[PDB]
A paper describes a structure:
Therefore, a two-step assembling mechanism was proposed for formation of the tertiary IFN signal complex, in which IFN-α first binds IFNAR2 and then recruits IFNAR1 (32, 34).
The buried surface area upon formation of the complex between sifalimumab Fab and IFN-α2A was estimated at more than 1,300 Å2 (as calculated from the PISA server). Our model did not indicate such a dimerization mechanism because no ions were found to be shared between 2 contacting IFN-α2A molecules (despite the presence of Ni2+ in the crystallization mixture). When mapped onto the structure of the sifalimumab·IFN-α2A complex, the region defined by these amino acids showed a significant overlap with the sifalimumab binding site. Rather, we suggest that sifalimumab sterically interferes with the recruitment of IFNAR1 and prevents formation of the IFN-α2·IFNAR1·IFNAR2 ternary complex.
Residue numbers in the entry:
A (entry chain A): 1 to 215
B (entry chain B): 1 to 219
C (entry chain C): -1 to 157
């Protein structure tokens, strides 16, 4: 079917550095039928390179491409902030056209510890019969952070969701919002709620916690 | 300028169909073939098939063979994509892209949302500012926008006035089938006396506009 | 446009050479010894039959012509309006070649994937490029290149 496997999954470089995206076909592709795209949030793909090397119009000189057989490479000689985006390769010499699973090129910056906040449920929701408890990690780097919910020290699992933002355009950091949800029946049968964050830029994990009635 | 402009967003139940469309301009419609690339939320691109606008020939990915028809209209320079017997996991932004690859021409993309969830407005609960959300001279507060379908909700603060400290988080599809989302604002904490904070959550598909004040309470 | 006549599509168009013709500005014999022997590899084309092996070689040649004439420099060197007609024609042939491939006509399945041949065409254009750079993209340098591609590309056609 010709399965393009891209590498790395995420490249973390600071502007000025050199990117090297890799694309690898399950079998050989003629270099003439290999392209590269760059996609940013809420946008269509954008052709960077066709026929394996050739730059599309408007694409600047710092972008280059090479490769043949099964191996192909996009190289951004000198990363500008403009360039941090997801990048895909595509083959188009055969029956289903296929894309690589993509490489996120994200800005690397100094490690930044998160600011952790917890918010209790509201009376309005409690009346409704659910308890959602929101934890908030504000402005951190790297993106890798562990948020563990602890109801009276029981490690919670499968009963929360989170969403992380996109890397901020100003300070290059991330933020996260885990929400633990329980029925009022469950929520009331326990006392202490804790959001324990743990993240590279912290000497020990930061717990934020409260007690019912006391909020 | 060549441009491909596609139809609006769609929300369908499973087993239904969509006929997304894609209108061409800036060139002769019939002279170049068009194909459809699809992208499920937070995932890669996926090529579906290809149509000779001129002669009406088609190629399809096996995945969709005999469930999708691509067609074109020369008089209206519009390419269509029909997708039948829809499934939850057809939820994705669909693109039309034009040959040849070197051309670099794509459309803005149409979002189809297949789900058995029904149109529903969100409950808006206040994330109340406390000591457990303060940190030396500033404190965070917010709104939990919970259990709405479909996307999107729009959320503003103090009827759009004080808003350059806000962070609204991208929605999350709950396992239930409804979406959910939180908007946090960080403000100066001594302002939690005077400044009244109201979040305005507007969800147009369910005709819903909720305004919620977020009152402090320190633990 | 649907590969229904593959013999058509594995040839280069006549309109291409025609547009290249019109693009000329300065004379041809005006540029005296301001010209290279660019060593085009004719081997890579025009073989009467086996225009199966050829599709991708013609595909990259055209992608190359396009990239050469799509630079800021080319845009300076040549008329805006002819260049737009030129890209449309070039685009057409790629669109047509790609059609055949997407329907299992002229799909390269050989060990080298015709890459040796591609590299050949590529080296031929890296020299064209090196020439324009070396000759600070002069009107002459360009006219030599224009006449050269025209000669080159003709080998891919019915003439
Ligand atoms: Ni228990
Ligand atoms: Ni499904
Ligand atoms: Ni055709």
């Amino acid at each position: 079917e010709i399965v393009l496997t891209q590498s790395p999954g995420t490249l973390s470089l600071s502007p000025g550095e050199r990117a090297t995206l890799s694309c690898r076909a399950s079998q050989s592709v003629s270099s003439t039928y290999l392209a590269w795209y760059q996609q940013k949030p809420g946008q269509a793909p954008r052709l960077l390179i066709y026929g394996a090397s050739s730059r599309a119009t408007g694409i600047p000189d710092r972008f280059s491409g090479s490769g043949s057989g099964t191996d192909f490479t996009l190289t951004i000689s000198r990363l500008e902030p403009e360039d941090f985006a997801v990048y895909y390769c595509q083959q188009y010499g055969s029956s289903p056209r296929t894309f690589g699973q993509g490489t996120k090129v994200e800005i690397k910056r100094t490690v930044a510890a998160p600011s952790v906040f917890i918010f209790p449920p509201s009376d309005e929701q409690l009346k409704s019969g659910t308890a959602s408890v929101v934890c908030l990690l504000n402005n951190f780097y790297p993106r890798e952070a562990k948020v563990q919910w602890k109801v009276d020290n029981a490690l919670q699992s499968g009963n929360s969701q989170e969403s992380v933002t996109e890397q901020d355009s100003k300070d290059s950091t991330y933020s996260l919002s885990s929400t633990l949800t329980l029925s009022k029946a469950d929520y009331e049968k326990h006392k202490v709620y804790a959001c324990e964050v743990t993240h590279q830029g912290l000497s020990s994990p930061v717990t934020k916690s409260f007690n019912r009635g006391e909020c | 300028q060549v441009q491909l402009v596609q139809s609006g967003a769609e929300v369908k139940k499973p087993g239904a169909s969509v006929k997304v469309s894609c209108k061409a301009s800036g060139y002769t419609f019939t002279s170049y073939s068009i194909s459809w690339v699809r992208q499920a939320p937070g995932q890669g691109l996926e090529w579906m098939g290809w149509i000779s606008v001129y002669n009406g020939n088609t190629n399809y990915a096996q995945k969709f063979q005999g469930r999708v028809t691509m067609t074109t209209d020369t008089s209206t320079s519009t390419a269509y994509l029909e997708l039948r017997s829809l499934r939850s996991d057809d939820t994705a932004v669909y693109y039309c892209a034009r040959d040849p690859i070197a051309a670099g021409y794509w459309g803005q993309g149409t979002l189809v949302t297949v789900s058995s969830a029904s149109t529903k407005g969100p409950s808006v609960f206040p994330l109340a500012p406390s000591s457990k959300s303060t940190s030396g001279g500033t404190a965070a507060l917010g709104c939990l926008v919970k259990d709405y379908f479909p996307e999107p909700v729009t959320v503003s603060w103090n009827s759009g006035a004080l808003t350059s400290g806000v962070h609204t988080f991208p929605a999350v599809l709950q396992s239930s089938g409804l979406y959910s989302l939180s908007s946090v604002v960080t403000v100066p904490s001594s302002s939690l006396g005077t400044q009244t904070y109201i979040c305005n959550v507007n969800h147009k598909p369910s005709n819903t506009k909720v305004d919620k004040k977020v009152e402090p309470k320190s633990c | 446009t649907s590969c229904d006549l593959p013999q058509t599509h594995s040839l280069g168009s006549r309109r291409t050479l025609m547009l290249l013709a019109q693009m000329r500005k300065i004379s041809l014999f005006s540029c005296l010894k301001d010209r290279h022997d660019f060593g085009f590899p004719q081997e890579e084309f025009g073989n009467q039959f086996q225009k199966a092996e050829t599709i991708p070689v013609l595909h990259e040649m055209i992608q190359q012509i396009f990239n050469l004439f799509s630079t800021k420099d080319s845009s300076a060197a040549w008329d805006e309006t002819l260049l737009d007609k030129f890209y449309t024609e070039l685009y057409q042939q790629l669109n047509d070649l790609e059609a055949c491939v997407i329907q299992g006509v002229g799909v390269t399945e050989t060990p080298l994937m015709k890459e040796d041949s591609i590299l050949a065409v590529r080296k031929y254009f890296q020299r064209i490029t090196l020439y324009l750079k070396e000759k600070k993209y002069s009107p002459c340098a360009w006219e030599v290149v224009r006449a050269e591609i025209m000669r080159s590309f003709s080998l891919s056609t019915n003439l």
